[PDB]
Amino acid sequence: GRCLRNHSITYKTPKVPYERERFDAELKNKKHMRTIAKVML
Amino acid sequence: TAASEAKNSY
Amino acid sequence: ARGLHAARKMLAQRRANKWADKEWKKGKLVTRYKCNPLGTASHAKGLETKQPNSGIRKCVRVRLLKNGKKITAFVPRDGSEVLISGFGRRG
Amino acid sequence: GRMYNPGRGISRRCIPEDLYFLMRAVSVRHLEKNKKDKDAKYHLILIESKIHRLTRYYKSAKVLEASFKYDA
Amino acid sequence: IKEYQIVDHLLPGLKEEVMTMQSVQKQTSAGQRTRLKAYVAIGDHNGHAGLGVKCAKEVAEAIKGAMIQAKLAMVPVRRGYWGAVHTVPCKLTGACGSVRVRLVPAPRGTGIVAAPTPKKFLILAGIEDVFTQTTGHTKTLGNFVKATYDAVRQSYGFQTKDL
Amino acid sequence: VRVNVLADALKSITNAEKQQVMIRPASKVICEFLNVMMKHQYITTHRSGKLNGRLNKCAVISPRFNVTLSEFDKWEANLLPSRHFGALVLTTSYGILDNTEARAKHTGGRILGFFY
Amino acid sequence: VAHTKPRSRTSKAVHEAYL
RNA sequence: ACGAUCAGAUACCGUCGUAGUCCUAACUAUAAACGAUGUCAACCAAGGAUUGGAUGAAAACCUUGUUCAGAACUUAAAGAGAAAUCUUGAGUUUAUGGACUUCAGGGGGAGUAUGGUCACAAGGCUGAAACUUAAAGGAAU
RNA sequence: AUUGGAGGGCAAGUCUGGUGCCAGCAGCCGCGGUAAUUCCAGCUCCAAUAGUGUAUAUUAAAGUUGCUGUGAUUAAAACGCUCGUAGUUGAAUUAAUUACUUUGAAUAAAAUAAGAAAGCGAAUAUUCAAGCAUGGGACAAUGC
């Protein structure tokens, strides 16, 4: 390890870079519990 | 009798 | 073998068959330290086309500081110690 | 199927010593005059392996004391 | 249903999707006799899906005849529940040629985890949650949709306990 | 050679139901496998003596992997068509059961096979 | 009849011996 | 080695002819050594004919029935496959697990180098890498 | 406010000037031999954005390493064939250990997950391979 202080990522870029059905829907900039529900169901 | 059925692939 | 106690062969079988893998073998046997001009490094400081395409590719020959081997290097752009870093395809 | 040949016979009785009888091994070891009979030699090995498979079995069953070793 | 208007009669407003246009050729003495083959998908989004194929000399003509075949090839899609309708009732696989596409029931939240081509057809059928795995040359579009179409086409044949 | 009677038995049943069926060797596992397949309703010689449109496919699993209770979820998710239809068959310390009572008897053990 | 010692205590060995 | 034919023909065509072709003894251990389909076990649609039985009928040989073993063949609206095709499997495989052994991982370089070992030798067995390249290949129209 | 791009993969011009298989671009398909949707320019819009290109390597894609899970007639791939040791796998049947299985004990923190990135009392549960105690003996292996 390198540091005692924790850190996290607050987003994840999509797998497919260019898809029209996503460019329109998403359009300042373009910058969990479902599975938690899943595991108990 | 085993003969009665005795007078095959896998 | 499939039986519950035959974990020795399948472990042994897989180890043998991994050596057939071209990509996997290249990263384990000793050529990245003696045959790769770049070694394991990214960049390296140093000092006519195929049939259906005609013209001339301007290129350069470079002698590396560390190994000393001579390699052919392309020039990037139109009308274009040297740092050389591979191409699109790895190796 | 058969132990050595590929034949698969089902001749059986239907209900409503053997090691001795395999030493056949001596009766062909005949090979003295016929030294070129390679058919007999191949079949001699097959009969011998039958003996060693039976020899190994009877020892662990304590039928034969484990000093047994069939020779020529 | 030997007529395409009847499915247009009992299933109005069939939302349309041309999967792709694929140009075939026939070598002859003069040259190549090229025709355009179009795969179209129809079907309301409530358990009815249809796939049809037609090839002709004109793009517009081939599509028009393609909707007919998809209309004629009408099949019901059996939907069900994951644990508690949104997904398939069991695991089904569509046996096209080299392509084998398998449908796995999915929980309420997950979308269509599938390639773009079987997705557009699986959206049409009326499914929203599904897990898919493919086995074969999926770059062959025609066999991809047929493998998808076949997978849902057998959903109403598997006699489960409730049936 | 005949290694597993259970493996031979279930393949005999599937091919018949795909096309009553007969099983020539009978063991302590073959029959009591069926009692699970009969209480789910799926089924109606001195020498180890010798179907209603419902059975889809019954098969055994090669070497009987010890199954923990926590491991039940992985096996059902793999070998069962859905979460409501099929049934595993387990041999446990309290007889041959399936994933229902073995989850209720609070025990694990080896796995025999299944039936949809 | 014990929990399941030699083969001289087993059931069909002793229940035959008992017989 | 001759004679032909041919632009040449050091080959196909014709004639002659050493090694070999045969047997013995010892080596070599490779072939499209192929069913290009490993061995063992259960199940699986419909037929006629066939090689050795045994049990009936019919007077050892021929004609019929019954049940096994063996080499096959015919049909399939079924099963499988990319298809050709396979069906006594190449079926019972994404609805993926009967037991075991061996082999393969894009095409070349290459069955090459080095090393080891067997043979009198030719060679056999084991067997890379550097480097090079977007195809090579299969079945069908 | 930049970075790369505008033929396809992959979102974005069948706009205008030159170059003429040359210079060049292009990770691959390929574009260029004088009318270039790909070159060098000018304009415009496309994705993300204080970030975005390039090279190298790990993982996923890869069911292209296969326990889950591959293929071996013809695409690469069943030893020419049989015997045989080690290995693995081994029919049914019966009213001492080990394996298996259930519970516990015991088990550094940090971290993981959990009761703006952070920070600080979670029952916080791990965390396997072993080892200890325990209820069970159906499937198994070892001799009796």
Next chain:
RNA sequence: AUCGAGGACUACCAAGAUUAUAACGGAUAACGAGGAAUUGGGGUUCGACAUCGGAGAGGGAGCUUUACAGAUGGCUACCAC
């Protein structure tokens, strides 16, 4: 002899120990673990580096003092500086 068990060592006696369930040997661009990256399940790759344990102070070796060192921001000799 050691703080102390023990071929750790010395004298006598014996022929024994391991190995195809991979011994012996070779390679590592090998300090090990807690962990990290990525993952549907299964897994693949990394872990010098926060914390635990190990080892080292240019290379060996020999010592001093002390309760603890084969210490090196202590000594002694050789090699190399």
Next chain:
RNA sequence: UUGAAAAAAU
């Protein structure tokens, strides 16, 4: 009876 060859890319 003889019967060989067709410069590179579009």
